[PDB]
Amino acid sequence: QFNPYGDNGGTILGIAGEDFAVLAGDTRNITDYSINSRYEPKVFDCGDNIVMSANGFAADGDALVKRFKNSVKWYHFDHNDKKLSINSAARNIQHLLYGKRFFPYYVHTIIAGLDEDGKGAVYSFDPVGSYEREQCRAGGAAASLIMPFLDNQVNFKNQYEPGTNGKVKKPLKYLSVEEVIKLVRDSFTSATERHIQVGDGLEILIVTKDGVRKEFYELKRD
Amino acid sequence: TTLAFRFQGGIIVAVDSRATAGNWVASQTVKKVIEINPFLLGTMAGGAADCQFWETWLGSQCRLHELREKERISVAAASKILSNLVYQYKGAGLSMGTMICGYTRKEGPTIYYVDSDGTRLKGDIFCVGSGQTFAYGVLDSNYKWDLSVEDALYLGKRSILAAAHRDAYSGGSVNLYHVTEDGWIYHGNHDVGELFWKVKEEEGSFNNVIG
Amino acid sequence: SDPSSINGGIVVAMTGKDCVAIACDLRLGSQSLGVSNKFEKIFHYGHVFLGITGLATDVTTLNEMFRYKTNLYKLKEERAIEPETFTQLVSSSLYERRFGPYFVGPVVAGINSKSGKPFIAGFDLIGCIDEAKDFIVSGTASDQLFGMCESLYEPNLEPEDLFETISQALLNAADRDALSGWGAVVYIIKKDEVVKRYLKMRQD
Amino acid sequence: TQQPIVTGTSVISMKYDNGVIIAADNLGSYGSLLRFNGVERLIPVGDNTVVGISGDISDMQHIERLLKDLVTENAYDNPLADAEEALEPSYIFEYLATVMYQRRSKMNPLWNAIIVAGVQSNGDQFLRYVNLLGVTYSSPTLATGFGAHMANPLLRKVVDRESDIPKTTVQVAEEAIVNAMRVLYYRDARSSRNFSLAIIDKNTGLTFKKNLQVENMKWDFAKDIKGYGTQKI
Amino acid sequence: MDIILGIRVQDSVILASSKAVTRGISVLKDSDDKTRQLSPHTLMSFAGEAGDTVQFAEYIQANIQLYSIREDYELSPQAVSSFVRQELAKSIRSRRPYQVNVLIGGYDKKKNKPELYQIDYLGTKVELPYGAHGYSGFYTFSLLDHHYRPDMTTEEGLDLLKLCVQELEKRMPMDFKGVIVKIVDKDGIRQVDDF
Amino acid sequence: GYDRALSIFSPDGHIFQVEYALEAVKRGTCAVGVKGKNCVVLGCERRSTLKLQDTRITPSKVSKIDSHVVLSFSGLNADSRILIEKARVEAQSHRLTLEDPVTVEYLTRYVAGVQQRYTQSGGVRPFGVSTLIAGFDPRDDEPKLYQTEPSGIYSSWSAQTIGRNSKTVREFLEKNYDRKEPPATVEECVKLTVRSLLEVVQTGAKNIEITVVKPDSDIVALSSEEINQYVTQIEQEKQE
Amino acid sequence: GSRRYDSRTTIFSPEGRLYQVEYALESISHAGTAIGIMASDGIVLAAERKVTSTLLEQDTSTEKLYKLNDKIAVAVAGLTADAEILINTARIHAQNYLKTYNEDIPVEILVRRLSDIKQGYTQHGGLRPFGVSFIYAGYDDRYGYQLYTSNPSGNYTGWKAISVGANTSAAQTLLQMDYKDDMKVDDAIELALKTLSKTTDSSALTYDRLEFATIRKGANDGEVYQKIFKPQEIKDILVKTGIT
Amino acid sequence: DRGVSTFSPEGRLFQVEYSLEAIKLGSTAIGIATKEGVVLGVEKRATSPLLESDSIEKIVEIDRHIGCAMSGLTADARSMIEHARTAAVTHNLYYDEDINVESLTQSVCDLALRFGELMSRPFGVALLIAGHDADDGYQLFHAEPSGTFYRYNAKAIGSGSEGAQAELLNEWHSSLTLKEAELLVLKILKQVMEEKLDENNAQLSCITKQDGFKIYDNEKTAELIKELKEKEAAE
Amino acid sequence: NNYDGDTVTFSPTGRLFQVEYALEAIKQGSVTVGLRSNTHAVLVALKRNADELSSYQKKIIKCDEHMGLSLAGLAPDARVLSNYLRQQCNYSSLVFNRKLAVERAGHLLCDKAQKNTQSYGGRPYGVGLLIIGYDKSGAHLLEFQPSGNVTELYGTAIGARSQGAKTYLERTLDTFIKIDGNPDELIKAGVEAISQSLRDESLTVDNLSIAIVGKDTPFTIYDGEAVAKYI
Ligand SMILES: [Mg+2]
């Protein structure tokens, strides 16, 4: 019988700073034990300072990003070129996903940008459109490898203040863009070593009030 | 694990914040209470998307009622909008366990349990989710109608903590709400990590864990 | 989960000299559980008698349906429907539900008011007509009724005799079926009089 | 939902400095590896695009008609149909990509893997893949079925990354493709000796080669192989 | 939704319905009323699939209440039961059938006679002196067959019901948390406060 | 289907089919609504040109929509049945979804909405009917009286009349009804309603129908003898 | 387009009347007279056939009096073809009610539905209304013996005695004059015939120009019989009352 | 007769032009936009003294940030209001924000021309749609049955419109306070109204960023009527 | 006279009067100008107000990044046709990853307008459009009329007293056609063109509406203080 779903592998990572946000993804596209491409981007500038990735089944991912980019276009036409706030974009994507509740888009979605106070925002979705704002989120194949590391190194979980008998927690603070990109690069090199579907290349999209900048870094090709 | 119970001081609503995909812990920071309107609360159990989407939709339907009838909707009417909606979808695979909690002058404090099978139940006490049995154990044992507001809030908080401990698919933090004639009041987010040890030390309970 | 043997029950019809007889058990059950001992399976539209075995919801529904159709027939035709014509109407109505059938085994009995000829017929659930000189059998003890009828029956029995033969055919068939019995009714049908007798039988 | 009956095997392709190469054998295969030969699986669309198709032959012939139908439609009320408003590889691919994905979403797929090889108006090399699931990807080397497993590894030794494309000549690229086709003939039970090769060059245009045969095969060593271990004779 | 009983005595019909609502391993409620008043002299108890029961009961209630207003007349118990049967008989060949079993107890003011109707989810209607749905009848039918009389008073009928409930509380695996009892006579519908 | 726009605008900005529908209402038998302190009364005229009538079975002029709301009307009798049926269905539909009987204002707003829809739908003419809708909201003791008309406009009235010679009986009510002090009792309210109809009817025999609605679904229709006593009392007091 | 040829059958006049309904009533006024009289112990239906021919088969003919079920009959006045469409609808509605409730349809419910169908043709669809007026004679266990009339407007009303069709003005004055409440069926039969005998446009009222029916409780113990009179039975009742 | 969507020789739609005549017959409605809020006032115009005036709803809430005043065949407005409320709530459900006043107006105006041989005739009612949003601040729109809408600093519609509009032309400036605008609506209503203006036959409302859309009580409007008379007598 | 009742009726001289009446709605509309060079295409529109308290009716609608129009006549009809163009531009992008040709845009508007002139019950569109765009064959200006007749032009004008601006462009043709890689100068020529269609009233800051599209210029609309430069 025909199976309408597939797994194109890959893994994505969103981190929110004080006055910035990053959305990272590996550039490897796979089916089973074959490499389809070593450079196939799945992190996209959608306009209005919103970056988006739909990781999982690439066909469903491309379809959703295409539909959302179109949703941004028609929001401008229908509401006098008004800027689509990240919170509004998130709710719109919930409806796009829940629209196919009984034939889901098999993807994990993460959008990054700035909220209306200019502070870094990351939203993560399930396949059928349940969503939540988060400081930190990894998605896709190697999510299970990256996410606990980010709990430790971003949210300082299970870290206490030396000499306080584990009574005083290590204080939460915003990380610089330089410190965040280090954690992203290490997160992906670590995932590349232990996950066969992750490697080839890492593409990071950084969102500030100035706009959307790109950085590329080579990963192991085995 | 979600619960809501009626008492002298109104309604207590307490929920956990954990989401799981199989044995993978997807989130520890989920908001399982939908605010809806200042006198109406919804709890979420089962499918995250099903609950979040349809209870947000319920908030829209409740707003339209109030624009059209120039009156706030009753908890009975609000609960039946949601129960009638899920009944249309019955057999399609919607997964929802839910409690509609609110005060209105004509009804008083009211709790309605609504699930995706189409069950709609009015009751004083309800616990819904994988950890409901753990919550019920603590709630039923210490529940009195004439509980104080401070004691009722603690019992709700304590009953979630009990379930968070024993249930693998419950945990993260406890979100506390108190519903009166004036409306609902948020009583904060309590991380189970810090709460557990505080409760153990102060209550002298949880003797089963290393001490 | 076999609709024709959830509720259970039997119908038998026989021809005699210038008479017909139709008889049924009174049991309605939910598999092993006996529910009602007053569930008659024989209905009449004027002088045409219809017995129906099988799923009890469909027995009630088809009775209500044929009452409806024969009531409209009489108003338009300005005369009671005859057995031969009613037989065709049962066949038409069942085959209309060919791929979603009524789980029933109907039996038609009556005397043609013009010719005076005794008439009986049986049907399957999709409306195939079994027209027979001798007898027709239906229900969960059909095998049992076929055995009793094929040995007990002889042609041109008088009404008083035909009563004994059909009665003994039903009673002995029902006693060898778990889902049949709990009482029995026999209709003896002459040209211009109809006697209805309730039989005393074992209540197990 | 369907099952493929008669199918085409691997389509292989790669980019070089001034264009793209694409090749496919001329065989249709039945159920238990039964063969049939005399099937062209390379569809030239205009003089700047070649569409290589693998999978169900019946679905391939349907797609062949859609492309012929597309060229006719583009000409309608178009004075620049043979110039600025001529069909591009990017346009033809996106059409096919759209069809493949909406067919899978209706649970009635076209049981094919497609590679669109061409040169754009600005001279940019175009090479992209789409299949029955509507999954799409681009790479300096693209292959379907067995080709993905056996051809890609060979073609990636010539062009491993984007920076290798300018250093790769048409002579080198064609040799690599022709060699890869022989390896597929050795090792694929659904391959044939006869194949077609197409070159789309920005300077020299589209060159279409038919009735090509695998040559310079190594079989001589077979005479020295006796039994399955211990047999000496 | 498990236990629904019905006894028709001389001058009234008594319906007894279990109070428990069980979802999974937990008993959610112990005070559930598995009945709707269809008209002032007609009561319907129900049991079956969750949601379907209440949805079906309320739908019937609305249709009978609509007839009552339109004609300014109370439909007879026989007429209400026939309407309810036809609705279930439609349901069974639907895309998604109502999985609901009902007892209809009514006092016919024209005949001055109590009437009890048992209808299953297939639309299998039967008129009985006493009835039950599901596993309830497994114990109660033998007991009623022994003790029941047609000329019993309401008090006699309630004592005979206590004997049925005691037998169920002894031999049934589930705790159904007791029964709500309702009497339907010439004066209408009242609930027995203590049982 | 038949699509023709029958209700359209004229150069002067009128919709003649809606205005001609009001003429049908003006031809209809007189209907009056008077609301007191703790009750509402609906009085209705029955033309006396019809003798050998069976009053038992003849459709009554006042219709119960629910146990707590009543609808009277002036205009085409056949048209009124369609509005009453739709209203009765909506009343049971409201109870089923909101778990509460309709307010009088809601039931009015629904009926008015139906009447409006028939003024800008293709292939249909407007209803030749104006309605008086009276009753008490659930768990409320404040009397409610609303009027609807073919256009679809509705509004609340202390007292109001519709149908033939309604302008005469409205004249009467405008000077005889005190806003500051409405009819305190049931008797007072029924008397003022009968008095107002006696300005128009002809005879107070089998020509006047009275229906008294009170809080908590307490609706009763008065008989001939009961109404005849009010007629006898008013005529004796008049001769002064 | 087609707008040019649309008569607009469902619009109001400036006076607020329905043209097509008014003109349909004008049509019905030229139809043969039908009289219904309701007694304490039964109902009489009498109707005049439209100018009979000598070679018309009288015995096997049905123009005026139609059976709806065992307890309800109608007298027709207007287009016979139009009446038969509505009669077959009414017959089905009755059997639908019996199928649903296992009770014979109450008279008013059948009348209201048939009246509601007529109403529809005046408010939507853009078709001509039914050129038919009915006298409904029926019995149910709620209101007992009942007379109703419906007309193309879809309005219906109850009556102790009523006429439809030709010379109703004259017929209604004669009924109003001689009718009383404690009247028997036999007395009502005599009134119906005497009224037709005086309102008829024919020279003399004969058996061959009449249709007659009674709904009595004449059968044994609390059951209703419908008697559609034969030609010979009309001839006998016409001599017995002393009109011939 | 003639088609419903027919053009006149002048190039106007007959049925649209005729509906504008219906709106002239309607009771007066006035709207004034300021930097402190937008005020909406209406003439109630009870046909008889027995009619309970408080039951005349010609000022209507669409969302918390958008109000509406109507003039013409007011029954026709019910489905327009229903659509506006549905559009406002639906947009909030899809985008988790308040919907722009212009976007809501544009939605209502998209019904207007959905008639022909869809509904049988145009709407016989004009709307004043007043609201606030973060982008374009306090706004007043005039929605016609033509499908056209204009933004206005101030606008009058209904029987006394041409007289009222001439008065608003002189009186309106960009520095008007909310209190000044309230008195100005009441002043111009009392000028064009047949019967004498009081708290029973006239109604005030406003929309402010802080408190949203509020219909003024009869007690509140009465004080503003008393304040208006004193200030006009003062000079 | 007898032949103007609907769009399905020819006159004895072979005229469609309902179409000719729709054409009349455009003449009553406010003036708008369109002109282009080889590099850029410009729309200039005179916006019309109800009174001094009212806003100025927006005349220019964006259809894609590379295409938009100005309207004269029934604004709601412009909304219907511009929404249709937006969808056709959108369909071309999503399905073919291809910017819709300005010529095809014309053909699609023509064929949509035509169907409404041959069917009973429906009416012709009561608006004229000037479509500008930059596609693969450079700058383009189109004139749409609700008869269905679409025309490609170097320049034109529609609305009341449009003949003044159309005459100027006819004279200026050889000058403005060669304004390549200079947006401001091409707008200035468009503003001087629309000025030939003014009577009593002059161009003010909230009165004038300009739009431009070109080689390295997305379709952008200038209103308010942004058009103060060109007065
Ligand atoms: Mg047995």
Tab-separated table of N, CA, C and O in Angstrom, chain D residues 14-60:
chain	number	residue	atom	x	y	z
D	14	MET	N	24.834	15.205	-13.539
D	14	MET	CA	25.795	16.070	-12.805
D	14	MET	C	25.951	17.413	-13.528
D	14	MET	O	25.656	17.481	-14.740
D	15	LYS	N	26.388	18.441	-12.795
D	15	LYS	CA	26.755	19.774	-13.341
D	15	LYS	C	28.235	19.765	-13.733
D	15	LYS	O	29.022	19.098	-13.037
D	16	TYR	N	28.591	20.482	-14.802
D	16	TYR	CA	29.991	20.823	-15.169
D	16	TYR	C	30.080	22.347	-15.321
D	16	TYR	O	29.077	23.029	-15.023
D	17	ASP	N	31.240	22.863	-15.743
D	17	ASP	CA	31.555	24.319	-15.726
D	17	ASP	C	30.512	25.112	-16.531
D	17	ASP	O	30.130	26.200	-16.056
D	18	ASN	N	30.064	24.589	-17.681
D	18	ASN	CA	29.245	25.331	-18.684
D	18	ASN	C	27.853	24.705	-18.866
D	18	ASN	O	27.152	25.130	-19.807
D	19	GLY	N	27.442	23.749	-18.025
D	19	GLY	CA	26.099	23.144	-18.147
D	19	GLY	C	25.913	21.898	-17.304
D	19	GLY	O	26.596	21.774	-16.273
D	20	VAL	N	25.001	21.018	-17.731
D	20	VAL	CA	24.608	19.770	-17.008
D	20	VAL	C	24.556	18.605	-18.002
D	20	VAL	O	24.274	18.855	-19.193
D	21	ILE	N	24.802	17.384	-17.509
D	21	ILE	CA	24.653	16.101	-18.262
D	21	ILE	C	23.604	15.249	-17.545
D	21	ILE	O	23.552	15.302	-16.306
D	22	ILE	N	22.790	14.516	-18.307
D	22	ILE	CA	21.762	13.568	-17.783
D	22	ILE	C	21.728	12.342	-18.704
D	22	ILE	O	21.880	12.520	-19.933
D	23	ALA	N	21.555	11.149	-18.127
D	23	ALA	CA	21.542	9.859	-18.855
D	23	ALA	C	20.552	8.888	-18.202
D	23	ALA	O	20.280	9.034	-16.993
D	24	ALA	N	20.045	7.934	-18.990
D	24	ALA	CA	19.045	6.917	-18.589
D	24	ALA	C	19.027	5.785	-19.621
D	24	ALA	O	19.042	6.091	-20.828
D	25	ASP	N	19.000	4.529	-19.167
D	25	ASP	CA	18.968	3.342	-20.065
D	25	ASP	C	17.559	3.206	-20.654
D	25	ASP	O	16.620	3.778	-20.070
D	26	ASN	N	17.438	2.465	-21.760
D	26	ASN	CA	16.229	2.415	-22.626
D	26	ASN	C	15.430	1.137	-22.350
D	26	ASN	O	14.983	0.506	-23.330
D	27	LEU	N	15.227	0.787	-21.075
D	27	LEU	CA	14.576	-0.489	-20.665
D	27	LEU	C	13.343	-0.220	-19.796
D	27	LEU	O	13.380	0.713	-18.966
D	28	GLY	N	12.300	-1.029	-20.003
D	28	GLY	CA	11.145	-1.194	-19.101
D	28	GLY	C	11.159	-2.578	-18.477
D	28	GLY	O	11.332	-3.551	-19.226
D	29	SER	N	10.944	-2.670	-17.172
D	29	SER	CA	11.051	-3.968	-16.468
D	29	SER	C	9.716	-4.391	-15.866
D	29	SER	O	9.080	-3.581	-15.240
D	30	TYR	N	9.403	-5.678	-15.961
D	30	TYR	CA	8.151	-6.257	-15.427
D	30	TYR	C	8.314	-6.679	-13.970
D	30	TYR	O	9.184	-6.188	-13.259
D	31	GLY	N	7.466	-7.620	-13.566
D	31	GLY	CA	7.374	-8.106	-12.177
D	31	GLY	C	8.610	-8.819	-11.677
D	31	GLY	O	9.369	-8.215	-10.903
D	32	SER	N	8.836	-10.047	-12.141
D	32	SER	CA	9.980	-10.871	-11.673
D	32	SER	C	11.233	-10.608	-12.509
D	32	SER	O	11.780	-11.575	-13.034
D	33	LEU	N	11.634	-9.344	-12.633
D	33	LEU	CA	12.800	-8.851	-13.405
D	33	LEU	C	12.689	-9.178	-14.897
D	33	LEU	O	13.723	-9.261	-15.529
D	34	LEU	N	11.478	-9.294	-15.439
D	34	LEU	CA	11.306	-9.576	-16.882
D	34	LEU	C	11.677	-8.305	-17.639
D	34	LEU	O	11.386	-7.224	-17.156
D	35	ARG	N	12.355	-8.446	-18.768
D	35	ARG	CA	12.853	-7.246	-19.474
D	35	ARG	C	11.988	-6.889	-20.677
D	35	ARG	O	11.204	-7.722	-21.146
D	36	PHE	N	12.153	-5.639	-21.091
D	36	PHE	CA	11.538	-4.964	-22.255
D	36	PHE	C	12.514	-3.828	-22.566
D	36	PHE	O	13.104	-3.246	-21.662
D	37	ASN	N	12.754	-3.592	-23.839
D	37	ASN	CA	13.738	-2.566	-24.285
D	37	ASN	C	13.081	-1.769	-25.413
D	37	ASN	O	12.250	-2.350	-26.138
D	38	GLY	N	13.442	-0.491	-25.541
D	38	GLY	CA	12.800	0.460	-26.465
D	38	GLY	C	11.863	1.379	-25.707
D	38	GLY	O	10.668	1.429	-26.055
D	39	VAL	N	12.393	2.046	-24.678
D	39	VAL	CA	11.691	3.082	-23.868
D	39	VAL	C	12.660	4.254	-23.685
D	39	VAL	O	13.723	4.049	-23.074
D	40	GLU	N	12.312	5.430	-24.213
D	40	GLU	CA	13.089	6.681	-24.033
D	40	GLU	C	12.581	7.379	-22.770
D	40	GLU	O	11.389	7.742	-22.742
D	41	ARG	N	13.454	7.545	-21.773
D	41	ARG	CA	13.111	8.088	-20.432
D	41	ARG	C	13.707	9.494	-20.266
D	41	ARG	O	13.591	10.045	-19.155
D	42	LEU	N	14.292	10.062	-21.329
D	42	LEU	CA	14.768	11.473	-21.369
D	42	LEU	C	13.830	12.301	-22.259
D	42	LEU	O	13.775	12.040	-23.477
D	43	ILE	N	13.120	13.261	-21.660
D	43	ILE	CA	12.129	14.141	-22.345
D	43	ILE	C	12.762	15.519	-22.521
D	43	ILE	O	12.919	16.246	-21.545
D	44	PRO	N	13.164	15.917	-23.748
D	44	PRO	CA	13.608	17.287	-24.000
D	44	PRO	C	12.396	18.228	-24.064
D	44	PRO	O	11.486	17.931	-24.815
D	45	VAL	N	12.407	19.300	-23.262
D	45	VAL	CA	11.357	20.367	-23.224
D	45	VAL	C	12.006	21.687	-23.650
D	45	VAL	O	12.793	22.237	-22.856
D	46	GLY	N	11.676	22.180	-24.847
D	46	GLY	CA	12.381	23.308	-25.486
D	46	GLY	C	13.786	22.900	-25.901
D	46	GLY	O	13.970	21.717	-26.260
D	47	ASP	N	14.747	23.828	-25.844
D	47	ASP	CA	16.168	23.585	-26.220
D	47	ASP	C	17.091	23.969	-25.056
D	47	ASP	O	18.290	24.200	-25.312
D	48	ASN	N	16.562	24.016	-23.828
D	48	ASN	CA	17.323	24.418	-22.613
D	48	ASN	C	17.047	23.465	-21.439
D	48	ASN	O	17.662	23.673	-20.378
D	49	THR	N	16.169	22.472	-21.605
D	49	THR	CA	15.736	21.559	-20.513
D	49	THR	C	15.632	20.124	-21.039
D	49	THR	O	15.193	19.938	-22.192
D	50	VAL	N	16.048	19.162	-20.211
D	50	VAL	CA	15.795	17.700	-20.385
D	50	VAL	C	15.263	17.163	-19.053
D	50	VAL	O	15.875	17.456	-18.009
D	51	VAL	N	14.154	16.422	-19.104
D	51	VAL	CA	13.485	15.801	-17.925
D	51	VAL	C	13.721	14.291	-17.990
D	51	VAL	O	13.152	13.644	-18.892
D	52	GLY	N	14.539	13.763	-17.076
D	52	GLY	CA	14.777	12.316	-16.915
D	52	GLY	C	13.817	11.727	-15.898
D	52	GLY	O	13.759	12.271	-14.776
D	53	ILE	N	13.081	10.675	-16.273
D	53	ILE	CA	12.013	10.060	-15.428
D	53	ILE	C	12.325	8.576	-15.208
D	53	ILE	O	12.682	7.883	-16.177
D	54	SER	N	12.169	8.124	-13.963
D	54	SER	CA	12.237	6.704	-13.541
D	54	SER	C	10.919	6.336	-12.861
D	54	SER	O	10.194	7.265	-12.460
D	55	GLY	N	10.637	5.038	-12.729
D	55	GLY	CA	9.409	4.516	-12.099
D	55	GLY	C	8.401	4.092	-13.146
D	55	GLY	O	8.830	3.832	-14.287
D	56	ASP	N	7.115	4.049	-12.783
D	56	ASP	CA	6.020	3.541	-13.654
D	56	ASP	C	6.104	4.233	-15.024
D	56	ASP	O	6.172	5.484	-15.069
D	57	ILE	N	6.111	3.431	-16.094
D	57	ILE	CA	6.194	3.886	-17.515
D	57	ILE	C	4.892	4.600	-17.891
D	57	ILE	O	4.970	5.641	-18.562
D	58	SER	N	3.742	4.052	-17.487
D	58	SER	CA	2.397	4.609	-17.782
D	58	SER	C	2.310	6.035	-17.229
D	58	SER	O	1.844	6.927	-17.963
D	59	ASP	N	2.768	6.238	-15.990
D	59	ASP	CA	2.787	7.561	-15.311
D	59	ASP	C	3.822	8.460	-16.000
D	59	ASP	O	3.570	9.675	-16.095
D	60	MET	N	4.928	7.892	-16.485
D	60	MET	CA	5.980	8.638	-17.231
D	60	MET	C	5.384	9.231	-18.516
D	60	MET	O	5.662	10.411	-18.799
